[PDB]
Ligand binder design. Structure first.
Ligand SMILES: Cc1cc2nc3c(=O)[nH]c(=O)nc-3n(C[C@H](O)[C@H](O)[C@H](O)COP(=O)(O)O)c2cc1C
Length: 128
């Protein structure tokens, strides 16, 4: 669920400033809760700091290329919370362009992968 109303009180995202080398300019409350990092470790930084051992170099290259090309993208990447816990991050990226069509910012929406249970599916599919 995206390309739909987005606020911090519900969602996990960050916003990068393309005019400052894609440094994060804003992070939702969910982002801090998910990663365990606080603003002092995030604002002004690049989100690559979440990557670590075993993060897939070819998925990282696909992200880098999508951003350079100004394209939307998603891919699952291994990331690490502040305590060193690995987690799978389903990262969706979307450019933000000005009226001249230049990329000025990127939004990144992260979803920490959790197991989806037969019970949760029953709830999703449960009629009417
Ligand atoms: C808005 C935005 C959000 C991002 N969020 C994450 C993230 O949650 N985890 C991550 O590993 N990389 C994230 N990235 C990707 C890195 O910032 C970086 O673009 C990627 O590692 C590829 O560039 P590099 O090869 O220079 O590291 C995000 C990028 C952007 C632009």
């Amino acid at each position: 669920g995206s390309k739909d109303a987005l606020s911090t009180f519900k969602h996990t995202f960050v916003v990068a400033d393309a005019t400052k080398d894609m440094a994060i300019m804003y992070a939702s409350a969910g982002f801090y809760e998910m990663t365990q990092y606080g603003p002092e470790d995030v604002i002004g930084k690049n989100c690559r700091f979440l990557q670590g051992p075993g993060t897939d170099t070819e998925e990282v290259a696909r992200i880098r290329r999508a951003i350079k090309n100004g394209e939307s993208h998603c891919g699952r990447l291994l990331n690490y919370k502040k305590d060193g816990t690995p987690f799978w991050n389903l990262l969706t990226l979307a450019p933000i362009k000005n009226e001249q069509g230049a990329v000025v910012k990127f939004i990144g929406m992260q979803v920490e992968v959790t197991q989806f249970t037969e019970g949760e599916l029953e709830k999703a599919m449960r009629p009417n």
